[PDB]
Scaffold this active site. Structure first.
Site, PDB file in Angstrom:
ATOM      1  N   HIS A  35      -3.906   0.807  -8.369  1.00 10.31           N
ATOM      2  CA  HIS A  35      -3.579   0.805  -6.946  1.00 10.31           C
ATOM      3  C   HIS A  35      -2.096   1.069  -6.707  1.00 10.31           C
ATOM      4  CE1 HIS A  35      -4.113   0.040  -2.750  1.00 10.31           C
ATOM      5  NE2 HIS A  35      -3.434  -1.093  -2.750  1.00 10.31           N
TER       6      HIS A  35
ATOM      7  N   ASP B 174      -8.231   3.589  -8.817  1.00  5.91           N
ATOM      8  CA  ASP B 174      -7.945   2.558  -7.827  1.00  5.91           C
ATOM      9  C   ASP B 174      -9.233   1.825  -7.462  1.00  5.91           C
ATOM     10  OD1 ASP B 174      -7.215   1.054  -5.540  1.00  5.91           O
ATOM     11  OD2 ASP B 174      -5.739   2.559  -4.943  1.00  5.91           O
TER      12      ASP B 174
ATOM     13  N   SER C  28      -0.767   1.011   0.911  1.00 13.32           N
ATOM     14  CA  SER C  28      -1.989   0.223   1.120  1.00 13.32           C
ATOM     15  C   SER C  28      -2.100  -0.126   2.602  1.00 13.32           C
ATOM     16  CB  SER C  28      -1.973  -0.958   0.149  1.00 13.32           C
ATOM     17  OG  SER C  28      -3.256  -1.564   0.056  1.00 13.32           O
TER      18      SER C  28
END
EC number: 3.1.1.23
Length: 275
Positions: free
Chosen positions: A252, A222, A110
């Site tokens: 995610h 996601d 991320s």
């Protein structure tokens, strides 16, 4: 197998104390992994990832970014992407000195994936492989300008309301995230928004600077970072050995999903192909 964790620390930018873990398996290390976590979390949400990597003879260095977990600094406070990337560069230097002759793998999830990409463009020859879990890399021109202006004057101002419930389809993961006192439970500050755009604004211009092989992981469902941004990254990087693994229906945190053992086994298979 048997992979023991040891806690260390180094002085980061602004002499902010940065705490990091070292996971070492009871075997001759095949390579070293330097891991960068995402927004609001910390390195101790990757114990099972470091243990899985140790099973393959990999040593894992995992740091808490400034303003995260055990490290110093105001919570989720950042003013430039270079603050994150310099501290990651310092950790890669530590691992390089401790294990000379080992291949270097940089892993980011991320926001950590955006950090690892910004570091990787600056130091393309300082690592051998790069693995990215849904990297925050492709973040109108008027909103990009205003967000980077705001984040440079009030980097601590709350802005964006993120859905923690989209991190994983596992209810135990969402619950463990929300009751963790070390985890940020607030809106995204303006400084972090500016730093994300900083890697996003320059990705298509600077992606050709990458040379080392690259693997991208991303779940198709996601809701925090769209998978199309990862499809566009793999088309822009200068690396010749690139591939994106899409996981249908996953959320995610592909490393935390119920199918994490399949995702982690795909990562180890990719690395063994190249180590």
């Amino acid at each position: 197998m048997t992979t023991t964790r040891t806690e260390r620390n180094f002085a980061g930018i602004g002499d902010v104390r940065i705490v990091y873990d070292v996971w070492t398996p009871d075997t001759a290390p095949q390579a070293v992994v330097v891991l960068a976590h995402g927004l609001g979390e910390h390195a101790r949400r990757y114990d099972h990832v470091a243990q899985r990597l140790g099973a393959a003879g990999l040593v894992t260095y995992a740091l808490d970014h400034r303003g995260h977990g055990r490290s110093g600094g105001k919570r989720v406070l950042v003013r430039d992407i270079s603050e994150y990337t310099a501290d990651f560069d310092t950790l890669v230097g530590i691992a390089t000195r401790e294990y000379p002759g080992c291949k270097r793998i940089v892993l980011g999830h991320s926001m950590g994936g955006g950090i690892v990409f910004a570091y990787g463009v600056e130091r393309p020859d300082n690592y051998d492989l790069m693995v990215l879990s849904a990297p925050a890399v492709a973040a109108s021109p008027v909103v990009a300008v205003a967000a980077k202006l705001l984040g440079v004057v009030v980097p601590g101002l709350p802005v964006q309301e993120l859905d923690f419930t989209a991190i994983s389809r596992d209810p135990e993961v969402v619950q463990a995230y929300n009751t963790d006192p070390l985890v940020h439970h607030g809106r995204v500050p303006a400084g972090i928004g500016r730093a994300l755009l900083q890697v996003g604004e320059t990705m298509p211009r600077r992606a050709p600077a990458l040379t080392a092989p690259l693997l991208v992981l991303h779940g198709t469902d996601d809701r925090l970072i769209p998978i199309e941004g990862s499809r566009r990254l793999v088309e822009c990087v200068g690396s010749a050995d690139v591939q994106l693994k899409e996981y249908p229906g996953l959320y995610h945190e592909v490393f935390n999903e119920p199918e994490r053992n399949q995702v982690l086994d795909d990562v180890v298979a990719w690395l063994t192909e190249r180590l």
